[model samples]
Target: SIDTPNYDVQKHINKLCGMLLITEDANHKFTGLIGMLYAMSRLGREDTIKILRDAGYHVKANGVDVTTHRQDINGKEMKFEVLTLASLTTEIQINIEIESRKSYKKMLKEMGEVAPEYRHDSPDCGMIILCIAALVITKLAAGSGLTAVIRRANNVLKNEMKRYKGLLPKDIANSFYEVFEKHPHFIDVFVHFGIAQSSTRGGSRVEGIFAGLFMNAYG
Candidate 1:
């Protein structure tokens, strides 16, 4: 408990549930839960299982992986991998979770297909909510290493958004700028977890392109 910081456990759990509820489907929701747990574990919190149970999730972890089980409305038992220490230690699992969700939604829209049930009207909400959950978990864990990584990621996103604002549509830019202005810390959580997903290519240009597209759709 050297660096442990007390906080609202239920509040963070609620936030995590909120994010999971907005996921595309059972699989997506479970994946989102897994990612959040992974982020929590990165801070070396042995209370991950307790937290998941507190969140109303049926979860269990083996040697290296966490798994969750739930029954849908139709009573189908669904089980999925929630977190893997292998990926958790490496740190790219959450990145892929955010990126894939972003691209999957965009791909659906481009194909003119209906979005999966439980999807949010705002495309950014999915990723943003995840980031919020990560931030909340980080706060709960209260570790300098985890905090530093999120801060670095936040700075990267802040700078990238600043550079890409000019290219984004007026409404999009204004909406986010105003929101971030009102809730300054959101930018930290958001930017900390922000990773642009673009199919065209890689680099800052692609990131900017995706950011513009995402914000435009969001606004």
Candidate 2:
């Protein structure tokens, strides 16, 4: 008796379900979205500046200035009024399709090694995206303590790599734990980030998994 609608709600639900079915395909299509964390966690300053150039932005790391000759539908060689991490990060990705396209062509040619239909462009394209993310994160992490750096990187790893947590490589897990162990409370960082996942019913099984993984690193 509570329900009353002139519109056909069931029809809407059916439409929504159809749209939702494409969600996974869309996620796989946007290679940059998934690869962003990897790039953000790994790129260093030198690598960032180098790739900024490769991505077609004229980056002057000295002044933290970036100018672009690429036009905006009708533009040329314009300097960004301000150079900020957000701006640089976005700009890198804007032109990064240039690199992604190159990777796509090379992968398509080697289609014989792997089935053409099964091949995905996400890996190399994602690397292009990752490189830009790493550049921004490295700049953000600069002058921060080693512990802080490791913690921040781990934060990204946990968030992005949660599905593959059990498979985290030995050296990678050990490196984070080496610094993370010093600050035992750093486990709180992962917990706060929801990677520890003890409070919820579904995540309860994965509870304390971070601690166990760290233990795996220690042993």
| Candidate 2 residue pairs in clash (backbone atoms < 3 Å) | 39-130, 39-134, 40-133, 40-134
lDDT (tens digit, per residue) of candidate 1 on 22-94 = 3333223233333333234332334444444454545444444333523232365444323334323323333
TM-score, every prediction? 0.22, 0.25
lDDT of 1: 0.35
Stretches of candidate 1 off by over 4 Å are: 1-39, 45-65, 68-72, 75-77, 82-219
Worst 10 residues of 2 by lDDT: 1-10
Predictions: Cα RMSD each? 15.0, 17.7
What digit string (tens of lDDT, one per residue) describes model 2 on residues 173-207? 24333323442322332223232222334322223
lDDT of 1 at 179: 40
Candidate 1 clash pair list: none
Top of the candidates by lDDT: 1
Best by TM-score: 2
